[PDB]
Ligand binder design. Structure first.
Ligand code: PLP
Ligand code: PLP
Lengths: 393, 393
């Protein structure tokens, strides 16, 4: 194994022996490609002319009116597909073609990573198959339809609890015996090494572009960069290029759920315990066994966190807070009403925490940047249902 | 009146005397702003950092594989909001603030222009009210909800046939008496002068960026630029900067409907007759009185066409074809399956006509550019219903 599979005591490769070759071989191919500028050349061609990079940086004056905070939104919502997932997905698609693979295996919970994979595969022309828990397949008709229109095969998983965990497990069993011709496109910066690394490297351009844009527009780095954290891909992708700029804030917002003190949430980082999950060793929400997570937001509905985040958390380089279903919903409505932008419910947690920092210190002089990971069009149904059940139509 | 209100025998200002002042005053304000670079400075700041301009240019190699056609898609689908409408809307919002107006009046059929106006108004902080036929208000819950989340007031119109025509008429009656403090944000390159002009000028950057990008990437202008035509805003916006490059094709695709020979369509340009409609004099679909149009696509469901298009058509500078519900649906599915992009059903007509030009002449050496006016996420429900009714699930 070329690279180090751990970040502190976190990360690793806790996967059956049958997967070591597939994992080791992926890592090599990856290193070999990181160093090949022909690859980098293609990757950037795709990110630039297909996905639409670089993504804007927006100054939200209306939202900060009457305070001393200056707020910027890194517009990942404007990327092709609607969210930051399109970055890493185009990366691995290429990587896979490089390794001469002819197929993609992926798993999705609500279909956000599913649609992303289907799309990358359509482009790079790879036979895509996406595992999805049956319960979710029923709850997500549109995205299932999207994946099908994009020529991907959605395989409903009925074992276990017929949900994300199960779809995830089955995906890996698939790959175990098909890694010869199929690349396993993991949806986030977690899982066994080298994924946490590969995903960080394939998302790090958002942090890069941010710094550049922030200089051109403010002549100085931000006091902090805030981003929601599920498995941690969009947060690490924004963090990366700032770990070094030590006087820059690195805040990660995890879902508060129904209240970090109800069990119904997903902030294992600050309220769980280290264990091995999804092939990695990191903090997670355990019973005594693994437990359940929750959020109005499905993307943030992860019971664990990426190894590098658990690490940056223990060293104290990055801070990790929590925002709840309602504070997120509030932010979601706020951005809609003042900036004319519908944020994804996931990003709403980060925008929420920013607003919190401003409303509590209107006189404080701060330059903040929230990573708007995706657009919220795919969440109006949900928001509308809640607002209706809450009796506010 | 400063500018000339006609394009050949088309265009004009056929509106009640009460509207001449409001119309004349808009025109002036517009000219004064065209010439003010402080305005241009703001407009471009908005288009660049809020909407995400410039929009990509994508080479669709997979779609043209095995032919001599080179196809590019001007990615208007990647603009904030999902379609080219966001350009002109941000323009008029500014113009209105410039004229010291505090309110926006608009009308929408399916809510695409409604959501756009609501958004521009949220940003530039203007009190937005959008008229919408009651029938449509029922058929368009999501967009109605979007407009409401963006703080706009949707006023259902129940007179006449409770649809677009009626919502449109009521909007103008509103403006008739409120132009003092309310700007009427017309949704397309049609209507009484100066709208056809203002909308062309506020969309012309797509054609501009295209030419620039096409040079940088091909070292030569395209043989043709193809775009769907409803009222004509996205087509003119692409055409504009190419009218002069005479050896460049200017194709406009109108909806074929159920077949240009069934009456159930919307290609008044090539199959109607000149009359006065929506305050302008242009070709339209008349009974003997005005008639009905149709398309799987609501955006293309217009019984008339913009005055400049009728003009460019008579001089023969630009060609106008027709594509049907099925050819569009076919294109829609094709782009999905090979490029991993879901086109808006409207743009599908233009992509359709392009594919037609390639499949019929695989050996012909051609460089084509289709204006992908919007993303098709807001059309999967429709496509899914058709495919299901057609019994293909
Ligand atoms: C999927 C998703 C996420 C959560 O994933 P990370 O791996 O923490 O980035 C965040 N935001 C959006 C909009 C997403 O779709
Ligand atoms: C509204 C719309 C159109 C039709 O309008 P034009 O005024 O002819 O541009 C075309 N494409 C998309 C995607 C639209 O939303």
């Amino acid at each position: 194994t070329l690279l180090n599979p751990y970040f502190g005591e976190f990360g690793g490769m806790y996967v059956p022996q049958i997967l070591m070759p597939a994992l080791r071989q992926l890592e090599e191919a990856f290193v070999s490609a990181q160093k090949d500028p022909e690859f980098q050349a293609q990757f950037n061609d795709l990110l630039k002319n297909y996905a639409g990079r670089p993504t804007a940086l927006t100054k939200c004056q209306n939202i900060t009116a009457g305070t001393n905070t200056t707020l910027y939104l890194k517009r990942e919502d404007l990327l092709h597909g609607g969210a930051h997932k399109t970055n890493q997905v185009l990366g691995q698609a290429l990587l896979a073609k490089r390794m001469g693979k002819t197929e993609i295996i992926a798993e999705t919970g609500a279909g956000q990573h599913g649609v992303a994979s289907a799309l990358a595969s359509a482009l790079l022309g790879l036979k895509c198959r996406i595992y999805m828990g049956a319960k979710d397949v029923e709850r997500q008709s549109p995205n299932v339809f999207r994946m099908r229109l994009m020529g991907a095969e959605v395989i409903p998983v009925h074992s276990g609890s017929a949900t994300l965990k199960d779809a995830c497990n089955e995906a890996l069993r698939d790959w175990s015996g098909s890694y010869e011709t199929a690349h396993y496109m993991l949806g986030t910066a977690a899982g066994p090494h080298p994924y946490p690394t590969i995903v960080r490297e394939f998302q790090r351009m958002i942090g890069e572009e941010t710094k550049a844009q922030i200089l051109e527009r403010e002549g100085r780095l931000p006091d902090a960069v805030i981003a929601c954290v599920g498995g941690g891909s969009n947060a690490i992708g924004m963090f990366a290029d700032f770990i070094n700029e030590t006087n820059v804030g690195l805040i990660g917002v995890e879902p508060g759920g129904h209240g970090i003190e109800t069990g119904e949430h997903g902030a294992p980082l600050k309220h769980g315990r280290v264990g091995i999950y999804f092939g990695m060793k990191a903090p997670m929400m355990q019973t005594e066994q693994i437990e359940e997570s929750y959020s109005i937001s499905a993307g943030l509905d992860f019971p664990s966190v990426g190894p590098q985040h658990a690490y940056l958390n223990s060293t104290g380089r990055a801070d990790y807070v929590s925002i709840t279903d309602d504070e997120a919903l509030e932010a979601f409505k706020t951005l809609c009403l003042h900036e004319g932008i519908i944020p994804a419910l996931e990003s709403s947690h980060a925008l929420a925490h920013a607003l919190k920092m401003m409303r509590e210190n209107p006189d404080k002089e701060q330059l903040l940047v929230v990573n708007l990971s995706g657009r919220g069009d795919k969440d109006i149904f949900t928001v509308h249902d809640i607002l209706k059940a809450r009796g506010e139509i």
